[PDB]
Every structure is written in structure tokens, then in C-alpha cells.
Design a protein around this ligand. Structure first.
Ligand SMILES: OC[C@H]1O[C@@](CO)(O[C@H]2O[C@H](CO)[C@@H](O)[C@H](O)[C@H]2O)[C@@H](O)[C@@H]1O
Ligand SMILES: [Mg+2]
Length: 580
DNA sequence: CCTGACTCGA
DNA sequence: GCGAGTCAGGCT
């Protein structure tokens, strides 16, 4: 059942038509400075397989790659583009990306290879990558005969599937979402990843020594208070020491034993001095393992830069994710871990780190979408939304709002977003269900429009089978009809949450696209480095700071127009840490 | 070599 | 709500 194709030893004219399905294979998961093991091209003239050494050394092929008028259809073009950037080659003209097309059609499928996407249209004349390359220790590039056939079949699938995918996207009203948002964004993410972020490894290594010391003191202390020695990182050994040897009370049980989660230990703290030391130990240990040692492992020794990979087709809400390393979860909440950020510095001398973040974008989106008069007015007055919520649900004046009141109103606001739950709120505020449900009820009394939205969005999810975001991203919720209370409730929360988190993601993605267009028009040297859900991190010459102070916020605030204003705060400094 | 338990972020 | 990386423990 083999597929016909030419295993070319040299590049020819017909291989350079103005439309083709292109495959530039990089098997290494992390594609940075990784090898391109083969190339496949399928067009009106036929199917071809080219050896990378050959094709990439050919002036005509490289020019075709960089010709914006020569259209290419691909799967995960960002992977190819970055792999090519490292080789000094530019990839242009990608008009269709099957990975992004599949992702928008149904994020739930978890499409990560051509075979998975093809299966959505009953196309199975191609094998899953894992079948061909294997995985883990067994992972490996097969011989040319098998490799060449696999790449050709993938190119063939892409070539065949483009039309049906575009047609459905069109029916879904997601055609612009792919062509004007996700695809252009893919090119921006590639530039960001390729650029990387400079790390002050000596700073990290010094912080590492200090931690190793402190971690050592707290460690001995723990063995001293426990009366012996054990693996504190062993939740199994810890549970025995705490609940058996020290007789501490059991407030929460896990699935395999006792629960030693911070939320539990926080309640045990009063009973024994070892609990605080275990918590502190848990802190320092997290910083050392993940952010010191874990980070140092992925810094490029030659450039001292870390090159993350943004997974643009994974989250169910439209958000990006980041790996190797994850630069979207760098410490900031606790001062000790926040210092980790001093290690992220500008990649050039006399340059600075500029960070801009949307203020309460999710709640503002909710105000717009629900059209709640009270909430819209609150933002129109640019009020401290948490103080305002407390004033309403506790019926008091601004002056009568105590810190504890605001803290709880804040927790209610956070819950309303993730999809309110009396039980979930109860655990968060450490109170009973009735009490939590009382707050929620009081909240809905103050924000009737929000309540109406929650009810209406759940109904719509059941009527249509999915919910959507501002820019037409969708999420199917089959569980919404489940007769199992728990399963159904999770789906209902997703129905409430996705349009909020999802619309917030659409907005920042568009802002990134708009911002890049503005930076180019202005010929500014400033460029994007990272995106952290609701914030943008850039680096630029110190001479560009003043222009950025006006430009970045404006572009971000004007990305979309809502019934309430969009607000962006910004800071800049010598290091990421100082950009506060 | 996979899963549970933990903690980091928005 | 949505994510990723570490460790320990069981696989084997
Ligand atoms: O660029 C990432 C891109 O590739 C996919 C596979 O289609 O993920 C691969 O690469 C990631 C980064 O190296 C890994 O985290 C992941 O495990 C690997 O399969 C897509 O998820 C993504 O869009
Ligand atoms: Mg913010």
C-alpha cells in the first residue's frame, strides 16, 4: 500500500511551485538548535523527499523557503521555523498550519501529530509519529526508506486535509481566528523562543549556595524536633513522623495515606514546632530544585540564555503553556523566591527589562460579557474591585471594610471567575459550606447580571454543546449533560470559566500581534521575550524606555474594545525582578 | 519507565 | 479554573 514519491538527490523546478504541503522534520522534542532529519514536499507536480544537507544547501530551495509568495501548508510550522532560524534560514509563506487548525476545531482531542489531526476527517493513510520513531529510550530516527515514506505521507495528509479543515473552521466562524490570530502569533512565538532570555548564572549559583546553607540548617532542625532522621521529601516518611511518632492530629487524608499538603500543615503548625520548619523546608527546597538547579540545567552554556518553547496548541482555554524551562511560573509571591527573578537580565548591555500587565482582565471581561451594571460601573470608576465587592456583599461603606473583609471578597472574586463553588470557596476561606454559599448568594444579589450570565452560559453549553470566547475560540463540554453530579458540575464550572479565561487569552494574543506591528513601524529595537497569561515581558535599549511607557500600554489597552476600559500597569528595570 | 503528591505561576 | 517540574515510590 506504499505511497509513490520521488526520493530526489537534487532540487528541481517543480519542487518549487507556489503552493505545497511542506514537512521539515525535527524529531527532537526540544527543537532548539536541533537537527532536521528530512524534508518532504507535495504539490501539483507530485510528491518529493529531499535530504536536508542537500535541500538546505541549495540556493533555490532556501530562496523558495523564504519567499512569502510561495505558500506552504504545514503541521507545527513554528517547530520548523525555529529549527531553521538556528541554521540562519528564514521560513515564510506558511498559509495553513494543520496543528493550529485542529487545535481550534477541538482542543480536547490533544492533537500532537499529523495522524491525530487526520483522524478527525477519517483520514488514516499516515502513521502516528510515535509508531515510526518510537518513544523514550527506544526513540530513534529510522532508516531513509522508512523515514522518507513517513514524511511523504504526512505531507500528503496535510495537502489533502487543508480544504476540509478550513471549511469547518469557516462554518465555526473560526477562519479568521486561525489566519489572523493563531498563525501570525505562531511566527511571533518563534522569534521569542529563538531570541531567548539571558540568565545571570553566577547570580543563580550564588543564590544556590545560600539556599544550600539555609536548607541545611532547617534540615538539621527538623531531625532535631523529630528526634531522628528521615526523608522530609518523602510524603510517606513524613506522614509517619508527623501523625505517628509526634501524634499530630489527622485533619485530611490523601488517597494513599495522610495529607501533608501546606494547607494541612498550616493548621498543624500550632501543635508542634516542626510544622513551620517543614513548610520552610518545602519552600527553600522548591526554589533549589526547580528554579536553581532545574534552571541551570537548561541554560545554553555558550550564550547563557534559556530558550523556552511555547506550546500554542495545548490548553483547553486558549492560553499558551511554556516548557524547558517553564517561564510562566517563576516565583514572585514570596520575597525569597522572587529574588530568583534577579537572574533574568537583558541580553545586551545598556538594555533593560520592560514588563506590562493587564489589571484584572478576567473580571473586566466578565463585566463586559455579563453586562452587569454594578460591575461595569465599578471598573468605569477604576475602583479597587475587591474593596468594592466587600462593600456590597457585606453591606458596609468603604471606611468600614476591614482587611479580613477584603481578603474574603477577594477570594469570592477569584472563585466567581474559576466558576464559583460553595465547597471550593469553603476550603479556600476555611469556613463551612453554608457560610460560603451565603457569600456567593450575597454576591449574586449585588451582581444580578453575573448571576444571569452564569445561569445563561450553562444553559447555552447544554443547548449548543459548547461555549465560545470573544474571538470565537470554542470548547466542547459533553459532560454538561452527565447524570453524575460531580462530573456535571465540573463541566458547568468550565462553561462559566472558559469564556472568561479564554477571552482574556484572545485579547493578549491580539495585543502581541498588534504590538509587534507597532514596534516594526517605529523601528524600535525592543522585542518580546515572554508572555505570562496576562502580562508581556520585553527587553530594549534604555533609550527606548520612555517610548515604550506610552506604546506598550496603549496597544494592549486597545487590542479589543469592551464595555469597560482595559487597564495596563507597567514597570521596567535592570532585571526582571526590578521590573516592578 | 508511569503515577501520586507537592508547589510554582496567572 | 488553566498549566509544568520536581521528588519519591512502584515498575520491573
Ligand atoms: O512546539 C511544541 C509543539 O509540538 C507538540 C507536538 O505536536 O509538542 C511536543 O513538543 C513540546 C516542546 O518540546 C513537548 O512539551 C511535548 O511533549 C512534545 O510532544 C505540541 O504539543 C506543540 O504545539
Ligand atoms: Mg496583572
Amino acid at each position: 500500500a506504499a505511497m509513490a514519491f520521488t526520493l530526489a538527490d537534487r532540487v528541481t523546478e517543480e519542487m518549487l511551485a507556489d503552493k505545497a504541503a511542506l514537512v521539515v522534520e525535527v524529531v527532537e522534542e526540544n527543537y532548539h538548535d536541533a537537527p532536521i532529519v528530512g524534508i518532504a514536499v507535495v504539490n501539483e507536480h507530485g510528491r518529493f523527499f529531499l535530504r536536508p544537507e542537500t535541500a538546505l544547501a541549495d540556493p533555490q530551495f532556501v530562496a523558495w523557503l523564504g519567499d512569502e509568495t510561495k505558500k506552504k501548508s504545514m503541521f507545527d510550522s513554528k517547530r520548523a521555523a525555529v529549527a531553521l532560524k538556528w541554521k540562519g534560514i528564514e521560513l515564510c509563506g506558511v498559509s495553513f498550519d494543520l496543528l493550529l487548525a485542529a487545535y481550534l476545531l477541538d482542543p480536547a482531542q490533544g492533537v500532537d501529530d499529523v495522524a491525530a489531526a487526520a483522524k478527525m476527517k477519517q483520514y488514516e493513510a499516515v502513521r502516528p509519529d510515535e509508531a515510526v520513531y518510537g518513544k523514550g529510550a527506544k526513540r530513534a530516527v529510522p532508516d531513509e526508506p522508512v523515514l522518507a515514506e513517513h514524511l511523504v505521507r504526512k505531507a500528503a495528509a496535510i495537502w489533502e486535509l487543508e480544504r476540509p479543515f478550513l471549511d469547518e473552521l469557516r462554518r465555526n466562524e473560526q477562519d479568521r481566528l486561525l489566519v489572523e490570530l493563531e498563525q501570525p502569533l505562531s511566527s511571533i512565538l518563534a522569534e521569542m523562543e529563538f531570541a531567548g532570555v539571558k540568565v545571570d548564572t553566577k547570580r543563580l549559583e550564588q543564590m544556590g549556595k545560600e539556599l544550600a546553607e539555609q536548607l541545611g540548617t532547617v534540615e538539621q532542625r527538623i531531625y532535631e524536633l523529630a528526634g531522628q532522621e528521615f526523608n522530609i521529601n518523602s510524603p510517606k516518611q513524613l506522614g509517619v513522623i508527623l501523625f505517628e511518632k509526634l501524634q499530630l492530629p489527622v485533619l485530611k487524608k490523601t488517597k494513599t495515606g495522610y495529607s501533608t499538603s501546606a494547607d494541612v500543615l498550616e493548621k498543624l503548625a500550632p501543635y508542634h514546632e516542626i510544622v513551620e520548619n517543614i513548610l520552610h523546608y518545602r519552600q527553600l527546597g522548591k526554589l533549589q530544585s526547580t528554579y536553581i538547579e532545574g534552571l541551570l540545567k537548561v541554560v545554553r552554556p555558550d550564550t547563557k540564555k534559556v530558550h523556552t518553547i511555547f506550546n500554542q496548541a495545548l490548553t483547553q482555554t486558549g492560553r499558551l503553556s511554556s516548557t524547558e524551562p517553564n517561564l510562566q511560573n517563576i516565583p514572585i509571591r514570596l520575597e525569597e523566591g522572587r529574588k530568583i527573578r534577579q537572574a533574568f537580565v537583558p541580553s545586551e548591555s545598556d538594555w533593560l527589562i520592560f514588563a506590562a500587565d493587564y489589571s484584572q482582565i478576567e473580571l473586566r471581561v466578565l463585566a463586559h460579557i455579563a453586562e452587569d451594571d454594578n460591575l461595569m460601573e465599578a471598573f468605569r470608576r477604576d475602583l479597587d474591585i475587591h474593596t468594592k465587592t466587600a462593600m456590597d456583599i457585606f453591606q458596609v461603606s468603604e471606611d468600614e471594610v476591614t482587611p479580613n473583609m477584603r481578603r474574603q471578597a477577594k477570594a469570592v472574586n477569584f472563585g466567581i471567575v474559576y466558576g464559583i463553588s460553595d465547597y471550593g470557596l469553603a476550603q479556600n476561606l476555611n469556613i463551612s459550606r453554608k457560610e460560603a454559599a451565603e457569600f456567593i448568594e450575597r454576591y449574586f444579589e449585588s451582581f444580578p447580571g453575573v448571576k444571569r450570565y452564569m445561569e445563561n452560559i450553562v444553559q447555552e453549553a447544554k443547548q449548543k454543546g459548547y461555549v465560545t470566547t470573544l474571538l470565537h475560540r470554542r470548547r466542547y463540554l459533553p459532560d454538561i449533560t452527565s447524570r453524575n453530579f460531580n462530573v456535571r458540575s465540573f463541566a458547568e464550572r468550565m462553561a462559566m470559566n472558559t469564556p472568561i479565561q479564554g477571552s482574556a487569552a484572545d485579547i493578549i494574543k491580539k495585543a502581541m500581534i498588534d504590538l509587534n506591528a507597532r514596534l516594526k513601524e517605529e523601528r524600535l529595537q525592543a522585542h518580546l521575550l515572554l508572555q505570562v497569561h496576562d502580562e508581556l515581558i520585553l527587553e530594549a535599549p534604555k533609550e527606548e524606555m520612555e517610548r515604550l511607557c506610552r506604546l506598550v500600554p496603549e496597544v494592549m489597552e486597545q487590542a479589543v474594545t469592551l464595555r469597560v476600559p482595559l487597564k495596563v500597569d507597567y514597570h521596567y528595570g535592570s532585571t526582571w525582578y526590578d521590573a516592578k
